[PDB]
Amino acid sequence: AEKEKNAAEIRQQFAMTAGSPIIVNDKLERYAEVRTAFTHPTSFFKPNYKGEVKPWFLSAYDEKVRQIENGENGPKMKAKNVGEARAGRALEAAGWTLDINYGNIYPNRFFMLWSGETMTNTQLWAPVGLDRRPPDTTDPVELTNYVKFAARMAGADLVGVARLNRNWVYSEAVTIPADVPYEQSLHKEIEKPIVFKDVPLPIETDDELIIPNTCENVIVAGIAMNREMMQTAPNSMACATTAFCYSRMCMFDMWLCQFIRYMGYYAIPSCNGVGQSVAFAVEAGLGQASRMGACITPEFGPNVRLTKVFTNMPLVPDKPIDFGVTEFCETCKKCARECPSKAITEGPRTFEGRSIHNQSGKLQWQNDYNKCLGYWPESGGYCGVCVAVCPFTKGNIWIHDGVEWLIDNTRFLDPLMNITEVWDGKINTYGLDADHFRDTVSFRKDRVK
Amino acid sequence: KNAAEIRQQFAMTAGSPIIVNDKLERYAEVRTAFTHPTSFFKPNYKGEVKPWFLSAYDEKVRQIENGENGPKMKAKNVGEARAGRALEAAGWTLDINYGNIYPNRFFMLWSGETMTNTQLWAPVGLDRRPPDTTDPVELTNYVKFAARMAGADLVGVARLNRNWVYSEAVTIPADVPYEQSLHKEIEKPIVFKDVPLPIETDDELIIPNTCENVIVAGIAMNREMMQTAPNSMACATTAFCYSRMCMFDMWLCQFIRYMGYYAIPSCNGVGQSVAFAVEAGLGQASRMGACITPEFGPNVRLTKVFTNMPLVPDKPIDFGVTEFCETCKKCARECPSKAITEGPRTFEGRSIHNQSGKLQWQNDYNKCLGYWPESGGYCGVCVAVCPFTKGNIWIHDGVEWLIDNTRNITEVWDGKINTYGLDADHFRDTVSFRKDRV
Ligand code: SF4
Numbered sequence: 113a114e115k116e117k118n119a120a121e122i123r124q125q126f127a128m129t130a131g132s133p134i135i136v137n138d139k140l141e142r143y144a145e146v147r148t149a150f151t152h153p154t155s156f157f158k159p160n161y162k163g164e165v166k167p168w169f170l171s172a173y174d175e176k177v178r179q180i181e182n183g184e185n186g187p188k189m190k191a192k193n194v195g196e197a198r199a200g201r202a203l204e205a206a207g208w209t210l211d212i213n214y215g216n217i218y219p220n221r222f223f224m225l226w227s228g229e230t231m232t233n234t235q236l237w238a239p240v241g242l243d244r245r246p247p248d249t250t251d252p253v254e255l256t257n258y259v260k261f262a263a264r265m266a267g268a269d270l271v272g273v274a275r276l277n278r279n280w281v282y283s284e285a286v287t288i289p290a291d292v293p294y295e296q297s298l299h300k301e302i303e304k305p306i307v308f309k310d311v312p313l314p315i316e317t318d319d320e321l322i323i324p325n326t327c328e329n330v331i332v333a334g335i336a337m338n339r340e341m342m343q344t345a346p347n348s349m350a351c352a353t354t355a356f357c358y359s360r361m362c363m364f365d366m367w368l369c370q371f372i373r374y375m376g377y378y379a380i381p382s383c384n385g386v387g388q389s390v391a392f393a394v395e396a397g398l399g400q401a402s403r404m405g406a407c408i409t410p411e412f413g414p415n416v417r418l419t420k421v422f423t424n425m426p427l428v429p430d431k432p433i434d435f436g437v438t439e440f441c442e443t444c445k446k447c448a449r450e451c452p453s454k455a456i457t458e459g460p461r462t463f464e465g466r467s468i469h470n471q472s473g474k475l476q477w478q479n480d481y482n483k484c485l486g487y488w489p490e491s492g493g494y495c496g497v498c499v500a501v502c503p504f505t506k507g508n509i510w511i512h513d514g515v516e517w518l519i520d521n522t523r524f525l526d527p528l529m530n531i532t533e534v535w536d537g538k539i540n541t542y543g544l545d546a547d548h549f550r551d552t553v554s555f556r557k558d559r560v561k
Numbered sequence: 562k563n564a565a566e567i568r569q570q571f572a573m574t575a576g577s578p579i580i581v582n583d584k585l586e587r588y589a590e591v592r593t594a595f596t597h598p599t600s601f602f603k604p605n606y607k608g609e610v611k612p613w614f615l616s617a618y619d620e621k622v623r624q625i626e627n628g629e630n631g632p633k634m635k636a637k638n639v640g641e642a643r644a645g646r647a648l649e650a651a652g653w654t655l656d657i658n659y660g661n662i663y664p665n666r667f668f669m670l671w672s673g674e675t676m677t678n679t680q681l682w683a684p685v686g687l688d689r690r691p692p693d694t695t696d697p698v699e700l701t702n703y704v705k706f707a708a709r710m711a712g713a714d715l716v717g718v719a720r721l722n723r724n725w726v727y728s729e730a731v732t733i734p735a736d737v738p739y740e741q742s743l744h745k746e747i748e749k750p751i752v753f754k755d756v757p758l759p760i761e762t763d764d765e766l767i768i769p770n771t772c773e774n775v776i777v778a779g780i781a782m783n784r785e786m787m788q789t790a791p792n793s794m795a796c797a798t799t800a801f802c803y804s805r806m807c808m809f810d811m812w813l814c815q816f817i818r819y820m821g822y823y824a825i826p827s828c829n830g831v832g833q834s835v836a837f838a839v840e841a842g843l844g845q846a847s848r849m850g851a852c853i854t855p856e857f858g859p860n861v862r863l864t865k866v867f868t869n870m871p872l873v874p875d876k877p878i879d880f881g882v883t884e885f886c887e888t889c890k891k892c893a894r895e896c897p898s899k900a901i902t903e904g905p906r907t908f909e910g911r912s913i914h915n916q917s918g919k920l921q922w923q924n925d926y927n928k929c930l931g932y933w934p935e936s937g938g939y940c941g942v943c944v945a946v947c948p949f950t951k952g953n954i955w956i957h958d959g960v961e962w963l964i965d966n967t968r969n970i971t972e973v974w975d976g977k978i979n980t981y982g983l984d985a986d987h988f989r990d991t992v993s994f995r996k997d998r999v
């Protein structure tokens with residue numbers, strides 16, 4: 113008879129001994145955030161469909177408008193009608209409501225405040241003094257259980273803890289000056305160093321973003337995207353599940369930071385800022401790095417968003433996991449073959465960055481991310497084809513052979529041996545799927561050992 | 562177990578289920594126990610008279626110092642007591658002054674024009690482009706799909722009944738900063754006029770006469786946590802769901818606006834959620850005063866969005882709640898303040914806090930509020946003990962569905978949890994396909 117899936121059992125089977133899995137060498141240096149394809153001058157500008165050179169997201173807007181008017185849900189993809197085309201883009205746009213300039217990357221601005229003191233919630237609760245009372249709990253075992261419980265309440269589908277590896281913290285952040293209003297923000301972005309100093313609390317000066325030396329840990333959250341919607345990549349509904357999850361990330365960071373502060377510790381939110389989420393997720397045991405460059409998780413594959421919070425709260429680090437992703441990516445290459453921009457390498461892992469957008473000195477598959485970004489204005493979205501076609505994104509990967517869990521190789525055979533339907537089909541709260549939602553149930557035993 | 566078949570079976574013909582008489586008038590929001598001068602001030606445990614929530618704060622502090630999770634409920638240790646209150650305080654992060662009631666302030670903006678998201682997306686012009694869809698059937702499917710993405714566990718549609726819209730809102734002057742908001746609350750008429758868009762003047766909150774519909778969302782609370790009522794973990798699931806309400810309202814208003822229509826958010830403001838929920842078919846009114854749903858009983862929060870978007874109203878539902886509450890009276894016997902009546906339904910309010918003129922069980926809500934400073938939380942014992950709150954009250958006799966008439970905090974922290982406090986044992990009940998959306 114079929115053994116009922118046990119996600120906790122699976123994670124237990126593939127747990128590693130302690131130690132950062134990421135292999136590095138001496139050319140490794142912290143990475144300036146302005147180097148990402150979204151922000152770097154070499155990659156920021158892209159032509160629209162008329163050949164006008166614009167900020168990438170503005171060229172993409174032009175393509176969204178053109179598709180709506182032509183009754184399309186994506187590049188060369190006709191919608192049922194213009195109404196459906198419009199609806200897909202209205203959903204996507206609305207998804208982004210609690211996110212600033214596509215990622216919330218500016219530290220200590222807007223939603224990403226490094227202190228809770230000015231927040232309306234903190235002000236309301238000030239007479240209780242939770243943010244000023246010394247911690248009543250210092251035991252990292254109890255704290256790990258409390259904070260992971262809180263993280264699930266705050267919308268995380270996965271949560272893990274790691275010691276903070278400063279190699280993955282950006283050397284300089286992209287931000288704006290404190291006196292710049294939102295409407296001028298995209299015009300006034302600057303760089304600001306992130307430094308570690310012997311200070312009691314996270315603080316920002318005119319010159320630096322200062323993280324205390326006592327900032328020991330990072331809490332990493334996985335925010336699951338919707339499979340049916342992502343499978344429409346590169347079309348509009350894949351853009352919508354992406355967008356909604358960014359707003360979920362933001363609410364997670366704020367909720368969790370407030371809990372940690374009210375427990376008597378400090379907490380730094382980040383969403384897409386501060387440091388490299390994939391590396392933190394790997395070290396916290398959410399999953400493994402992959403050819404496409406994302407963290408692949410046992411539960412969702414790469415079809416999951418990441419955010420993280422940094423804290424001095426004593427915690428128990430989780431163990432990394434090795435469930436064989438590296439070995440499958442070595443032989444699969446489906447993402448590389450399907451990628452519309454040929455951004456993803458079919459070659460071996462190296463320590464040498466492909467371009468300025470990669471951080472050299474760590475062993476990974478080196479992808480050309482200027483090529484990736486270049487496809488976004490052409491398609492009018494955020495693509496995601498690589499996530500959509502990855503076999504680990506399918507719900508059906510895990511089987512039990514009577515002794516242990518293993519990955520079903522039939523899912524990796526190549527060749528294997530619409531959007532109206534998504535709007536008319538299965539949905540549930542936050543786009544979560546009740547057929548698989550049991551996989552992320554949590555009891556104390558799986559929160560702390 | 563099949564929730565879609567259950568709702569289908571108990572569907573009623575069209576028409577508001579709420580019985581009213583000629584005495585019924587719209588209710589001034591200031592009259593609620595939270596805000597009215599007769600009920601607002603309560604003593605703390607030292608005998609000092611303060612705003613009710615400040616006195617309740619004093620009890621939270623006392624409990625933490627004394628290692629308690631609630632009134633006369635010892636925690637495992639002071640650390641656990643602290644953790645429950647930290648979780649509760651954190652839950653409220655996206656909520657203003659306990660309920661987001663001030664209309665067109667903070668998160669509850671009646672236009673999307675100044676929002677950072679609207680500004681970022683302005684070159685696409687979705688909020689300026691006339692609607693491409695006017696068909697109420699397709700719009701109902703689209704907006705309900707969006708509602709589920711936005712965090713609703715239940716969603717329904719009703720024509721807007723203006724009887725449940727507050728005659729006058731509690732709000733603050735528009736240029737008063739948050740830090741002065743509690744001390745500068747005022748009362749402001751909500752009026753319906755022939756105008757193109759929702760608008761606020763110095764004198765009035767103006768809703769257009771074209772505002773035909775209300776979309777009501779149910780946001781499920783956590784059963785294990787609510788069952789700790791009146792202790793701190795019940796406060797925590799309450800708090801987190803208020804921030805979920807807020808995000809729902811903003812997400813869905815933005816979707817509706819980007820579809821070419823206008824949308825008014827509300828959370829606990831603007832009007833009476835229970836009446837809207839009943840008219841939208843989410844559930845039935847109960848003895849305790851809450852909307853009881855087939856899926857969650859009363860253990861579910863409500864919010865609503867008002868719009869001119871053409872929509873298909875849902876049918877009201879009758880699964881026998883009224884007859885059950887007739888003989889049950891469990892909430893009423895367990896209520897720590899004896900706020901809930903054991904008597905029959907009437908059209909006459911017990912005090913200023915009730916809206917007279919509608920047939921309901923009339924409860925004393927000043928008595929309810931009085932228990933919150935004494936216990937240091939938001940109680941919820943009535944929700945906790947209600948048989949409809951229990952996991953599976955639904956059975957099937959081989960032809961149809963029917964109600965089964967037969968029917969610590971450390972362990973909660975150490976026990977089952979899942980994303981947003983939802984339960985995979987029951988999460989299938991709220992799965993949705995087009996056929997159940999419209
Ligand atoms: S598609 Fe194949 S090669 Fe690419 S990330 Fe997924 S498993 Fe790895």
Ligand code: SF4
Nearest residue numbers: 451484495496497498
């Ligand atoms: S998002 Fe699209 S263009 Fe970018 S790497 Fe993935 S498949 Fe290629």
Ligand code: SF4
Nearest residue numbers: 848886889890892947
């Ligand atoms: S406890 Fe009993 S009387 Fe009270 S609301 Fe529930 S079913 Fe009705």
Ligand code: SF4
Nearest residue numbers: 896929940941942943
């Ligand atoms: S919340 Fe508590 S005091 Fe208020 S009515 Fe319910 S049981 Fe009674």
